[PDB]
Every structure is written in C-alpha cells, then in structure tokens.
Amino acid sequence: SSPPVVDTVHGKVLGKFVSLEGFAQPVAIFLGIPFAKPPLGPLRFTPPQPAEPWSFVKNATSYPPMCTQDPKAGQLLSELFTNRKENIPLKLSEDCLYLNIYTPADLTKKNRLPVMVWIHGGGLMVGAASTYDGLALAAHENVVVVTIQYRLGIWGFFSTGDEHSRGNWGHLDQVAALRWVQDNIASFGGNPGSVTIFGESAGGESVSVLVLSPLAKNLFHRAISESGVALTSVLVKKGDVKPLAEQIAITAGCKTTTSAVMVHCLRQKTEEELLETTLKMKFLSLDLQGDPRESQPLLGTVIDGMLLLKTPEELQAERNFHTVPYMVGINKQEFGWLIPMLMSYPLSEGQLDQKTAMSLLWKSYPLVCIAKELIPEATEKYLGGTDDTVKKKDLFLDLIADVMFGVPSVIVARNHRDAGAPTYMYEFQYRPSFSSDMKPKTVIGDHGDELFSVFGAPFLKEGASEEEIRLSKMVMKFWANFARNGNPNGEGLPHWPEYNQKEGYLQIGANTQAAQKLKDKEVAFWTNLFAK
Amino acid sequence: SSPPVVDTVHGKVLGKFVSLEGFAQPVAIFLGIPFAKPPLGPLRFTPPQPAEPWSFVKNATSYPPMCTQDPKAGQLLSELFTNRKENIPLKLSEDCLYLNIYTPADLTKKNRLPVMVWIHGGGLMVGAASTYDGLALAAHENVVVVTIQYRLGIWGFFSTGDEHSRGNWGHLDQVAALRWVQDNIASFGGNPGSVTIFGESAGGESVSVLVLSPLAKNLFHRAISESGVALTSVLVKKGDVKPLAEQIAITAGCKTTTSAVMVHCLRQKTEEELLETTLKMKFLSLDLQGDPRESQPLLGTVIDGMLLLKTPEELQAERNFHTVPYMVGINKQEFGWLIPMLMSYPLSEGQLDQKTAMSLLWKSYPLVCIAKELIPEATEKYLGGTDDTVKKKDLFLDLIADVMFGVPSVIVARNHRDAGAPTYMYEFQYRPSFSSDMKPKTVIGDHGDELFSVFGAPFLKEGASEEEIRLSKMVMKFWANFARNGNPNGEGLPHWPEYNQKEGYLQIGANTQAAQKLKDKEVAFWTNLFAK
Amino acid sequence: SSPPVVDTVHGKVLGKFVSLEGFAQPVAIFLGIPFAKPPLGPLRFTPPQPAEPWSFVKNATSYPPMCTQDPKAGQLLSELFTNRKENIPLKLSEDCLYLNIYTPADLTKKNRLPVMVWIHGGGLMVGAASTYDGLALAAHENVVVVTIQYRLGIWGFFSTGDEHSRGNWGHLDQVAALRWVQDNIASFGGNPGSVTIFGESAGGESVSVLVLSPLAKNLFHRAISESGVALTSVLVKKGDVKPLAEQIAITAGCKTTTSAVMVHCLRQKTEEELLETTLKMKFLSLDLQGDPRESQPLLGTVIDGMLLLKTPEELQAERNFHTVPYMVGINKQEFGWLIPMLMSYPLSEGQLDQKTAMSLLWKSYPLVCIAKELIPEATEKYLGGTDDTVKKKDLFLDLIADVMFGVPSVIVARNHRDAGAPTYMYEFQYRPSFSSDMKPKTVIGDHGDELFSVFGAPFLKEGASEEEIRLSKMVMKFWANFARNGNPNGEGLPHWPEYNQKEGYLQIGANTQAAQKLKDKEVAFWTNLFAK
Ligand SMILES: CC(=O)N[C@H]1[C@H]([C@H](O)[C@H](O)CO)O[C@@](O)(C(=O)O)C[C@@H]1O
Ligand SMILES: CC(=O)N[C@H]1[C@H]([C@H](O)[C@H](O)CO)O[C@@](O)(C(=O)O)C[C@@H]1O
Ligand SMILES: CC(=O)N[C@H]1[C@H]([C@H](O)[C@H](O)CO)O[C@@](O)(C(=O)O)C[C@@H]1O
Ligand SMILES: *[C@@H]1O[C@H](CO)[C@@H](O)[C@H](O)[C@H]1NC(C)=O
Ligand SMILES: *[C@@H]1O[C@H](CO)[C@@H](O)[C@H](O)[C@H]1NC(C)=O
Ligand SMILES: *[C@@H]1O[C@H](CO)[C@@H](O)[C@H](O)[C@H]1NC(C)=O
C-alpha cells in the first residue's frame, strides 16, 4: 500500500504501516510528531509553546531524540524497560518535545477509538517515549497508543521558587501534549472524548499530579498510576527550593546574586554544560557519606502556583474539583532489585543486621524521609521479625518499598474513593522472563515488571511462555477496558472489585483473583510513625 | 541650495544633490535608507521585519555595507559591473538591508514618476546595490531609480527544508523592499502605482521568482529579467535540501541532531565564523576532481511553500495568477568570459577537443545539470560542427550559455506569452569599451555587458564613443518606456515587436533591428535531450 | 505583630515592621519590590518592561542589589551619604530595577498620605536606593517614602544617537517606577494623587529632566531638585554622541561597522565585561594630561526625541506644557570637598595661584565647559579678589560650584517661575556632624550636606546635637509640607517666601531666614561670559 498520511492542525504527517502477527489491519505508526516549539535558547525554563506549522508533508518516520539526560543511565533504563526485542539506541537533545502515535484504526474511514497516552518514568531525570513500543497494545485491544516525552532534570524541573522560574516545566509539557491530543487525535482514529493517561514510576507520579492539577482538567477522562503517585515524597519537593537552585547554579558556574540572575546565567549555558552539571550533581545514585538531610536525590515537582496551587496532601483533602476513574497499583517488590541496583545500594552482602539497617535507613533519607528518631522504631517493626540476616535484608527492602509506593499509593486511592470518584487498585506479583540476567530469580514483582504485560512484550520479544503470554493478554484487556468504560472488568476476565469501602483490589499474576485491604496494616503503622 | 530632506513613514531622511552634465534639475540621492530591521542575532534565518522609526533627521549620505560575502569576489564583481568611473570600496556587515534612491524629480513639487527597482545579481552569494549608480538613468529617462540589497549566501538562503528554516530569506528581503517602496516612494516623486522591477543574472532570476510568487503580488507592475530567469537551474534548488543544510552545519562546527538544533547553533556563530564557513564551502568556483553530482554550486532559491508553493516549472504551467508585462533577455555570449573566469574554468588552452569537452561538460554538472549519458549527444550536437579545436572551445561556451540562459529564458518568455501577458525579448550583442582588459577582444555580448547601456555608463565613465553613447541612450529609452507603459516602443526608436506567436524579438547592438524565433532551434534540441 | 502583607497588582508582598523612637504606629518597610522586568540579555539598552506577576507572597525583606557600577566608588558614596548608623554593604547586578517603600500608615485602614519618591544621585554612574533610609522621614512627617533605582552608566545611558539605542534608559526606569507608584502606592496608604519627586545631584538633574519630559507628565505633582538641575552641563550630553558610543564599543572590544552592530555586540558582553569597560573608561575621575575637550566625564542624559524632544534650554523657553510646584536648592559650598575629593583634584597644596587656576579651570572643561579663551576673564573675576593663594583656592572652588550648580539652578527656577508655576529656592549652609573626618572643618554646606537633615540622620545616627536635631526636624517639615500643599510653609516654621519677582529664597542653617536674589550677581556675569 501507500504510507499513511494524516493531516494535523500544523500540517501533514507521513508515517509507516506495520502489521503484527495475526492481525489483518496493519497499524499506522508515526514517530516524532512535534507537539511544541523546541525549548531552545530563551525558551529554556519557560512553558512549552505551540509548534510552528509546516508547509508540506512531514516525515514522522524516525525516532525522536530523548531529552538531555545522563546518557549511560538513560540507555540502561531503556534496555531494562523496553518491550521490543532490540533496544533502539537514542540521541540526546534539548529538542525533544515529541510524541509517538500507534493507531490500529483504518485511517481511510472515520474512527474514534479510545486513546491511551503513556507517560514514561525515570525519576523525572531520565527516560524516553521510544523505549515503549505501542504496536502490540494498539493491535490487541484496538486503541490508539500515544507515548509522549517531556523535559527532564534541570531542563524540565529547575525552580528558583519564584516567578523567574516557577518550575514544573516537564509537567507543563505533559499538559501541552495532552492538549495536542485533544486537537489532533481525531485525525488518527482516536476519540478525544475518551483519553486515558497512564504512566509508571515518575510517570505514575506525573499522572497522579495531572489528576490534582486544574490546568490538566478536561484533557483526559481516566487515569492509571503504576508504581507511583503524588505522595511519593522523593519526587515532590516541599519547602524552600531556593537552596537547590543556588547549588545547581554554582555547580554550573553561575552567580547567585538574584533569582533573575541565576536563570539568565543558566540559559546561556550550553546543553552540554548543563549535562556536565547534571553529572556533577549525581542525582540518581545514593550518597553514602555526609549528611542525609542534605543529599538532594533529584529535581522534582514543586508547588509553582500554576500547575499545583498547594501540596498534594492538601489538594486531595478537597473534593471541590473534577474527578475521573482512577486506577492505582503497585508491584509485589517495588524495591526488589531495579531501583536499589540503579542507585548503587550497599546491599552486596545479601544480608543485613539491625544496626546496619538503621544506618542505611538513615542514609536513605532522601528516599523515605524518615526522621532519625523514628529509625529505631521503623527498623524494629520490619526487621525485628526474625534473626535471619538475609530475611532482614528482604524485609528492609519491603520497608522502603512500602514508604515510597505501598502506603502512598493506598492513601491516594482511598482519598480518591472518598472524594466520590471510581477507584481501582492492583498488586502485580509476577517475574517477567524478560528480567535482567543480573536480577536474582527470587525477586518477583520488581519495579516496572508489569510494563512487559501492559505493553505486550510477549508478542514482540521471544521466549514468552504460554503462561506469560496469557498474562499479558489479560492485563492489556483490563487496561483497555478501563480506557473504554472507566472500569477494567469485562467478559472472560476475573472480576476486579471496585476499590470501595471494602477496599477490594485485584492481585495480578500467575493466579489473578480479588483480595481486600491492600497494605492496610502498613498504612496504619506509617500514618502513626510519621505523625511523630 | 539646501540638502534634500524627505519625510518617510519611519522618519525624516536627508540626502544630497548631484547634477548630471546637461541637466538643470539636480538629482536627489539618498544612500543607505533602511527598509528593514537589521537581521542580527535571533533574527538571522527569519523573515525581514519592519524597521524601527527614528526620531529626527537620518543622514542617508553614506553608502551602506554590502551583505556578508566573499570580500575578494564581491569586490571583483563590483569593479567589473560598476557603471561609475571610480569603483566604490564597500564594507561587509550582517546589517545590510538598505536601499539607495536616485530621484530626478523636483521634491518641492508633487511628482509621480515611474519607479524602477533594481535587483543586483551575483549568484545570490555576492553583490551590492552601491555597485550600481542610478544617476544617469534617473536624469536621462526621468524615472526614480531604486537599488536594493538583500541577504546573500548562508545568511539569505540557508534552508533546513522544514519549518525551522524554510529558506529564501533573501527573496523575502526583496519583497520587504518592494513594500517599502509602496509605502514610501511617493515622498520621493515616485508613483507607487507604476513600479518596475528589473535585475541582472541572480537578480534576473529574482525578478523571475517574484513574478511567480504570491507574496510579491501587487508590489510591482512590470518586470525585466536580464540574463536570468527562474528556470536557470543552478540558482533554484529542487529536491531534498536537508543534506546541504547538514554539510553547512558541520563545516561551521555544528551538531546535526535535528533541524531545530542546526538553526540554533548557526544562529550562535559570529558573522566572521559564518564567513569562514562560506569560504570553506567554495561556492563560486568549479570543482575539478571528485563527483560532479555532489559539488554544491551555491545556496539558491528553494520551494519553501511561502514564497514559492511549487517549482517554477509547475508554477508557470498555470495561468490562474496575476500577470504583468514581462521583458526577458540574454546576451550574445553569456558564457563568453566573465563567468568562466570567475569560476576558474580549465579553458587556459584556448582550444578544446571532443573528449575533453565531454569531460568538462560533466564536471559542469552543478551548472548545466546534464546527465552523464546525455553528455555524448550534447557535445556532438555543438562541437561536432567542425574539427577546429578553437571553434570547439567557443561552441562549448555556447553549449553552456544556452543551457543556463538561452533556452531557459525563451521557455519562460513563451510561457508568459501563452499565459496571456505582454511579453518582450531581446538579444544584446555589443562589446562595451568598459570591458576588462583581460577580456578577449573577440568576446562580444558577454555576461553583464548590457549593464553599461542600461545604467548609462557612457555618461559617468570616460572614453565612450558616440556609438556607445547613442546605444546607451536607446536602451535607457526602451527600458524607461517599458517602465512607463509596459511597452518598450516609443518615437525615435527602432520598432520592438511584441514576443507573440511570431516570436519576434529585438537584437540590440551596433545595429538594432527586429528578428524572430530566438534560440528556437536550441530550445527544441534541449527539450528532447532533457526529456531523456 | 504579624509582618505587613500588601497586595499589589503583580502579587502579594511581605514586609517588616519597624518602630521609631517616640512613635507608636510602627512603620511598614518593604525592600526590593520589582517595578520592572529585569533588563537582562536582549532587554539591555531597551525601555523597562512590566514586571511578571508572582504566584504567592513575595518577601520584600532583603535589600536589592545596586545597579552595576564601580564597586569601590559606589560603596564610598553610599558610606558618605547614608543616613543610617551602619552603612549597608550592597551587591552589584544588572537585575536592579527595584524600589523600597517606607509607609507610616496603618495598613489595616485606608490611608492616602502624600507620597515622596526619592531619586538617588551619583552622576548617573553610581548610587543605590538602599543608601537612603526613609524610616525617620516617614514617621516624623507621616508621608510614604519611596526610594527607587534606575540603570546607571553604560547599562542606563549608552546611546548610539539613533533609533538602535536612543539612550536615557535610566530615566525611562525612573518614569517606569513612577507609573508603578501610580498603580500601587494606594495599597500602601499612599495617595497616587499627591506624588512628590525629589532627588539630589544626578537625582536632582533627573527630577529636573522629568519636569521637562512629556513621558513623566501626570506621574507626579511636585518636584524638588537638590544640588542639580537639567542645566548642569556635565550630565546632559548635547551634540553628536556617536563618537562616545564608538569609543565605548571599541574599549569593550566591539566593531563599529554600524550602530545596530555596536548595540548587538555590547548586548553579548557579560555584565563583568561591561563593568571592566566602565573602569577602563575612568568616568568619575578628572583627566590631567591630554586634551580637556576630549575627556568624557560620563554617559549622561541625551536628547532622544522620546524623553526629551529638544535641549533643556530650548524646552524651558516654552510654557505650552503642564507645570507643578517646583523647589530648587543648592548648598553653600557645592564644590567644597566631596566632589573634588572623589574626582581626585590636584588641590593637595591647599593654595592656588592665578596661572595654575587657569590651568585647572581648563582641564576642568568636561565639568564647567568653559572655553579656553574665557578662562582668563573668569579666573580674574573670582580669584582676582585677593593675593592670598589660599583664598584663591577657595574662590576657585566657588567658581566651579557656581557654574555647575549656582547659576544653573537659579536660571531653572526663574524660568519655572516665569512659566507661571509655583517656585521655591533655598541655600543650605550647615556642616553636618556626620561629615567625613577627612573633610576640613572649614567646609560648610558641602555637596550632599542637606541629605542628613532631609532624611533625619539625627534620628538614626548618634551624636546629633540639639541644634542639628532641630534643623533636621524643620527641614523635613518644610519638605513634607511642600509634598502636601506644594508650599513649604506651615505653622511653627520660618516664613519661606515664594520665588517670585522679588526672587526671595530661604537660607537654611543654624539661622534660617528669608533673603533675596540668590546668585543674582553670578548669573549675570556667567550669562555674558558664555554669550562669548
Ligand atoms: C558607517 C555608515 O555608513 N553608516 C552611517 C549611517 C547610514 O545612515 C547607514 O549606514 C546607511 O547609509 O548613518 C550616518 O550616515 C548618519 O546618520 O549620519 C552615519 C553612519 O556612519
Ligand atoms: C526535524 C529533524 O531534524 N528530525 C528528524 C525527523 C524526525 O522524524 C523528527 O523527530 C520529526 O520529523 O526525521 C527527518 O528525517 C524528517 O524527514 O522529518 C529529519 C530529521 O532526521
Ligand atoms: C537570593 C537573595 O538574596 N534574594 C532575595 C530576593 C529579593 O527580593 C531581591 O534580592 C530584591 O531585594 O527575594 C527574596 O526577597 C524573597 O522573595 O524571598 C529573598 C531572597 O533572598
Ligand atoms: C520521507 O519519506 C519519503 C518516502 O516515504 C521519502 O521520499 C523522503 O525522502 C523522506 N524524507 C526524508 C528525507 O526524511
Ligand atoms: C550628517 O548628519 C550630521 C549629524 O547627524 C550632520 O552634521 C551633517 O549634516 C551630515 N554630515 C554628513 C555629510 O554625513
Ligand atoms: C519569607 O518570610 C517568611 C516568614 O514571614 C518565611 O517563612 C520565608 O522563608 C521567607 N522567605 C521565603 C523563602 O519565602
């Protein structure tokens, strides 16, 4: 046939057709469609602006650049999370506000399939949209998959705390992409009236935030947060961000006379100079020596007064805002391997004792934000269970996993439920055959493990057992059904109870069945510990 | 008595009076009147913007800078084309969007004399308005002469092929100048309702382009193309210009990640850095060794979708656009000396044989764009006439001259005629006494040789014979009469037949008389050869 | 005891409360309130633009930076003029368009106290608003004191003489600050309908200029010029400023091809680079060897055609403009110590003779602008009084003092009077106890000596005798009374005659009483000498 040419508001776009095994209707794929003017030069540290219209047919046939980030870590995360067989090597650029579209619709006719916009994770410091291939999900559940990109690290989250650089540029880009979907997705067989946003980790936190933001209202109709919500501390900076701004400014060789001066100076720096500063800051690794209360993990979401008017805690306390069906989930062992490995945790012994745990739990401050006075009690509650040093290690990993995702996620769901909107929860417990070889075979339900089911990895990568394939089909079905009706259930699928007062949730894995009061016991413990 | 002070829309302008031998009314001359905002910094590679208004009286008494170009070549061409006795040495600057005005009208009264706007040539790489002195033409034919400048080379034609740098900046400056004339020329005794545009070589091509462009519609009412039209290949880049953009970016020490990145990087380079890149690219000289299909002659006109919606060929096939009297001409020997000399052609032997000719005709690809398979037939059709090696040389020079100007010019004229608009053609055959000493005395009607007649060189430079003086008078008469009524004819002048179906044209020279079917035989030949 | 929080157009501002000895109602102080967008990058050498609005509560609790200037000289002048006990060390920055507000009004209620906007002096090269503490004045006279800042030196007065950089940026900032007062002062208990502008030295000349400018019309209703008016040559550049522009450009390592090129180049320079250029230019010190007619004192006010349509002289000759009560004053010995000391005058001998005088009066050209032919007559008229070499020194100082302030001030006052507007004059003769120790005890009424009475230094610094304290009270009374009714008089205060035809003025000092025809004899002499 002839390559797919869709006419968007800004101009014509030329994609390519790809057929999936066992599907007649080939899927139309468009790579690198600009949804905003390149945030270069003076546009750096300012809201994303509308893209300039193009005169003829634009070739959306090449993978776009991933936003500037640590090239090593960024690639590593892409190999570890990609659902396609061969990991696609990417390029770094400040010019990265693009989005990829995977539409199973027959463009030759009018279609309004539900739209699923994916927001990649990566601690808001690394990541890319190209990592995720939407071919399987689009074809299998007949939905339009849209993977978007947003400014990362300094470029997307630098904030002086005042009007000279409010911050949250990255989030504003996500909002900008959603508006683009509203104004263009129809030309791709998508229904702008049924847009579902879903992300994992930092992406889940992003979805969480968009759900609380007034700007994002009416740009989506369903939300899914996989392993990450707006109560995941490490990602949301509360307090005076001015010190961090000055520390970054100095590290980049910038004066700190005034806020206006810092932003101006940083806007003069080259993309490369800022990247070097990023590497000097050492943002994804854990700091061993020094003072834990000073170690800055990353540049996250802030309370800018535009995107967020107050803290996520304060915002979710009110119900005076528009609500939509929300699905919040976590994996069995969120801190099982992936994260600890990437941050270079001192767990090389395979075992830990009471004292060393308290020592680590303290240095883990930037991740769990647990006072040093609470350390004793917390460690006792989890590791005091047994004397087995190896069990204390795994229990220590549960400690962290719960503080970062378990409890935060459940509190978020509860508040969403009490606000009166349809809520759903799940706990993914499965070990994908696509796990890294360096990942211990005992770790099941590690961070990002559900990504292989959601994105139909079993149908793009080889070796998936009939069990894994079946699992992926189920998950995609649930996800797509949710995208369709704001309810995961559907014929031929295990019943998924709504997260109401009974607090029922679905345990997804080799044996998928409903259960109740997820992490109920832990949320209780931590709500008191943190209440000092 | 008192220097001329005209009030334009942007502010007052002060010029100077200059009397020509035999004319009572002194001519008011204004040099360097800004018609746009300096395209400095971020304005680089962007459409020309309105000039900022000034507060008092601006001195238009000094020659403006000529746009950044090869200083050596630019000066050389200026010396070779100037119609004034002493060649005026110019300065290079990115700040060059100015125009010069020569008005014979008595500013103390209301006058509405026909306006002639001159577009200098120079392969769109070099050239300047100051080269041309309009004093003689203005006084002699009582018309307002306006010599404009536009961005050359990289500065005025850099194109990434997309919306991040469409290209054709230079042309847009020309259109910007014409708009300036419309809103201001009346303050100088000019009739904005009778504006004629005329240019030579690259300027002849510009006039041809402007005639095809929707943007320049209604900014002129007659056009004259001397030795150059929109079908003169070398100047009109067809196909993917992306590679040339990247090759330039790299030579300037820039990344090529994306089009937006290239334009950003090139916008950071200093004028000097870009001038060095220009010189490294070696754009005016012919490449001897390597592959001819790769040798990029220059950065010409492109199909941006703004100035030109499709190719010149495609555009002239339609008659759904506004038309005006058009005069198209060529010189007897376009590739006689000047051009080959500036491009450093291997013709130092004064003689050529069948084999060497095919060899040269091939390396001349970027000029004639003749397939290597056609070379044999072409060389045979021209040099196969005799065995005289010296005659083969000259016949080779006609070969080129016809492909670049002869045939293109005649096709354009025919299309214009068939489109239903008043068309006129001419063939200038004369050897000005102002020719370079290094120019063989046998070459008559070389490139740019009519410039001395058109601009009345015989009345500014010395030694003109009464025959040459008389010829210049006649040419200026024809040109101004055309500028006046869209018809060259007038009492006291040889009848100039309209280029209608009989294809009558005027042969201007020592003996000026009508003729018919100019280059009719060659157009036929080349139309088939190129039809492969 | 809750810090004061005022809501301005652009956002909420948080200040601090400060109680003065003997005043119940504490004064609300706000430091560093932005009244314009930081003039960084491309905004350099362009008019001030509106400040971007802020999202929450901005802390106006830290002193803003002083505009880039000679750090050493700037600090010295701040120490010498400050009315607070401890001089506040400041920081340099291009980001300096801020203002400080001292309001005695009880914000919890609606107040419309008269507003006094202070413009600091410093030859338009140095100075800061923080130097002046409005606490005493605000409290003692119950008026809102506003100290503003404006661009200095190159940043605020660079002019190419054309539209590419008209100049007078600093003055435009002053007008920008006044508009801010109009749109916000009400929120601080101020009355936008009763705004009085007053400054000293360069600030006095600024007030004078604003009184002549059409742009500042309706932004103030009363004006006070202390030791400086628009006829103080040294600050107002008349003639072709192009040469100075080129000299600065070159000194900063910039081409001078064209005006647009110079401005572009200088815009690229870093604050530090321009600061270095400033120091190289050596603008506040006197040039000993070379040609006096070339020594450029500073970058002053120019006739841009925006702020000033013609020269101050020419402007005050007309009465077709809006007028307000104007108070013009001078000190007994304007060139007594401070100025000569800062400019490094060769007066280290304490005595001078007729010949050396003429020698100095010549090199003092950039200050007094006296022709070398007039030097003889002028020196004779002043120093010819006695043979005492020490008396000649002091008489020489009066010579200068009268040419720069005495005569200028009186001419301005007379014109203002004749123009039909309420005029007042005064001559301050008092030696503050806060004078520098290096200042001879014989100098009384030195430049800036009234600053300590006007700003109530006696109530912030220690050691003020009951005589000095009383003087300050009186002065502030006169000043505030003027700010209130456009007339200094009031009960319990010596009668201050209006400067009408009798030319009565007030001599302020240990003995304050009216007098007549101030400098009437000198104005006479100089009006002829300068009439050549
Ligand atoms: C160096 C030069 O040629 N520039 C000159 C410009 C011209 O107006 C423009 O360049 C276009 O001529 O302004 C002047 O002529 C002028 O107003 O007195 C002086 C200046 O030197
Ligand atoms: C603009 C740019 O330089 N990027 C690349 C694009 C990508 O698709 C972009 O992400 C979106 O066009 O692909 C091209 O081949 C294209 O023809 O558009 C050009 C280039 O290599
Ligand atoms: C880093 C610094 O010293 N700047 C200070 C600025 C000032 O407003 C400006 O410098 C003008 O005074 O912002 C603050 O006042 C503020 O809003 O909290 C505090 C901050 O410390
Ligand atoms: C876009 O794709 C078409 C064919 O699908 C091709 O002709 C064109 O060159 C491509 N554009 C580029 C150069 O990326
Ligand atoms: C140009 O203008 C200057 C001042 O702007 C003026 O003195 C003179 O009339 C002119 N000088 C020349 C001929 O450039
Ligand atoms: C402003 O003052 C408040 C107290 O009034 C304080 O909390 C804050 O830290 C200060 N500055 C900032 C960073 O907002």
Side-chain angles (χ1 to χ4, degrees), chain B residues 42-327:
Chain B
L43 290 182
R44 196 178 302 179
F45 309 128
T46 86
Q49 280 170 57
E52 302 292 6
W54 48 98
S55 295
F56 303 95
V57 179
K58 174 186 292 304
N59 277 44
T61 52
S62 300
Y63 287 107
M66 59 178 180
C67 303
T68 321
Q69 54 187 284
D70 182 345
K72 295 177 182 176
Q75 168 156 283
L76 179 56
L77 188 69
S78 180
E79 301 185 311
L80 286 168
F81 284 166
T82 189
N83 68 315
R84 51 172 98 275
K85 25 169 273 301
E86 52 157 284
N87 182 213
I88 300 299
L90 299 174
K91 243 67 182 172
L92 290 182
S93 175
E94 291 187 306
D95 172 23
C96 60
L97 298 183
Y98 299 81
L99 54 74
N100 295 327
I101 299 176
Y102 300 90
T103 182
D106 173 42
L107 297 172
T108 76
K109 300 175 179 171
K110 183 251 293 178
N111 297 94
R112 273 70 226 282
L113 306 179
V115 187
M116 301 189 85
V117 185
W118 174 255
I119 304 179
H120 76 68
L124 304 185
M125 297 294 314
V126 307
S130 308
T131 295
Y132 311 75
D133 186 356
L135 181 60
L137 177 60
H140 277 262
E141 287 310 322
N142 201 253
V143 298
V144 179
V145 180
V146 177
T147 57
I148 76 171
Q149 282 188 172
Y150 52 100
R151 288 176 272 180
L152 307 164
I154 296 184
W155 293 270
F157 295 101
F158 175 74
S159 169
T160 49
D162 55 10
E163 69 282 17
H164 297 124
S165 191
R166 290 192 161 65
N168 295 335
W169 315 119
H171 289 314
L172 293 176
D173 297 326
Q174 298 172 329
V175 174
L178 287 177
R179 294 192 152 302
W180 184 84
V181 178
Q182 287 298 301
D183 309 319
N184 298 278
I185 207 54
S187 297
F188 300 84
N191 171 28
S194 194
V195 175
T196 299
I197 60 174
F198 66 136
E200 189 275 337
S201 192
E205 183 257 20
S206 287
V207 169
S208 187
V209 172
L210 290 175
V211 170
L212 299 173
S213 176
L215 301 178
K217 187 192 169 191
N218 298 306
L219 295 172
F220 63 103
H221 319 82
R222 305 158 207 317
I224 304 174
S225 288
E226 300 163 29
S227 306
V229 297
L231 291 183
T232 296
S233 308
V234 64
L235 294 178
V236 171
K237 303 300 160 188
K238 303 178 197 63
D240 183 33
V241 308
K242 197 56 172 299
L244 213 201
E246 283 169 48
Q247 195 184 305
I248 292 172
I250 299 179
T251 302
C254 281
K255 264 147 48 186
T256 55
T257 324
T258 78
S259 294
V261 179
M262 304 192 274
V263 193
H264 176 68
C265 181
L266 288 171
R267 285 211 175 86
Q268 313 304 299
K269 299 296 171 178
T270 71
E271 154 179 43
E272 178 49 59
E273 312 200 74
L274 290 187
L275 175 48
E276 291 208 358
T277 305
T278 302
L279 301 177
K280 289 184 183 178
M281 300 287 296
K282 293 173 166 181
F283 300 118
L284 159 84
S285 294
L286 179 71
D287 191 6
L288 290 180
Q289 59 282 65
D291 188 282
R293 297 170 305 183
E294 306 179 305
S295 306
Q296 181 58 202
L298 53 80
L299 323 175
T301 307
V302 292
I303 312 302
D304 56 345
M306 293 272 299
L307 181 84
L308 292 174
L309 311 178
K310 37 187 58 178
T311 59
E313 300 66 30
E314 289 166 42
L315 276 179
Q316 63 182 176
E318 144 271 295
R319 295 81 172 66
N320 305 66
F321 191 57
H322 176 86
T323 46
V324 306
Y326 194 11
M327 183 190 291

Side-chain angles (χ1 to χ4, degrees), chain A residues 31-32 58-62 64 98, chain B residues 162 242 257-259:
Chain A
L31 305 173
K58 180 181 289 296
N59 280 36
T61 54
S62 309
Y98 300 80
Chain B
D162 55 10
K242 197 56 172 299
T257 324
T258 78
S259 294

Side-chain angles (χ1 to χ4, degrees), chain A residues 162-164 166 255 257-261 264 303-306 308-310, chain C residues 34 38 40-41 52-56 58 65 91-95 98 271:
Chain A
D162 58 1
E163 71 277 19
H164 296 131
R166 287 191 164 65
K255 258 150 50 191
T257 322
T258 78
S259 278
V261 176
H264 175 74
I303 312 300
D304 58 349
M306 292 275 297
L308 294 176
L309 311 174
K310 37 186 61 184
Chain C
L40 310 183
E52 302 295 5
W54 50 96
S55 287
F56 300 100
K58 179 184 288 305
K91 241 63 179 185
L92 293 184
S93 177
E94 294 187 305
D95 176 27
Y98 297 84
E271 154 176 48

Side-chain angles (χ1 to χ4, degrees), chain A residues 230-294:
Chain A
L231 289 184
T232 296
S233 311
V234 62
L235 291 181
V236 171
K237 301 299 156 190
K238 297 178 200 66
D240 188 38
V241 310
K242 197 59 173 301
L244 213 205
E246 286 169 35
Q247 195 181 305
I248 289 171
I250 299 178
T251 305
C254 280
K255 258 150 50 191
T256 56
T257 322
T258 78
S259 278
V261 176
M262 299 193 277
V263 193
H264 175 74
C265 179
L266 288 174
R267 283 203 175 94
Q268 308 311 303
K269 299 299 176 177
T270 76
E271 151 181 44
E272 171 62 49
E273 310 195 71
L274 286 195
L275 176 48
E276 288 207 359
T277 307
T278 302
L279 299 176
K280 290 185 181 178
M281 302 285 294
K282 288 176 168 177
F283 300 114
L284 153 94
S285 289
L286 177 71
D287 190 359
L288 290 181
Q289 59 283 65
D291 185 285
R293 299 170 304 184
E294 303 177 309

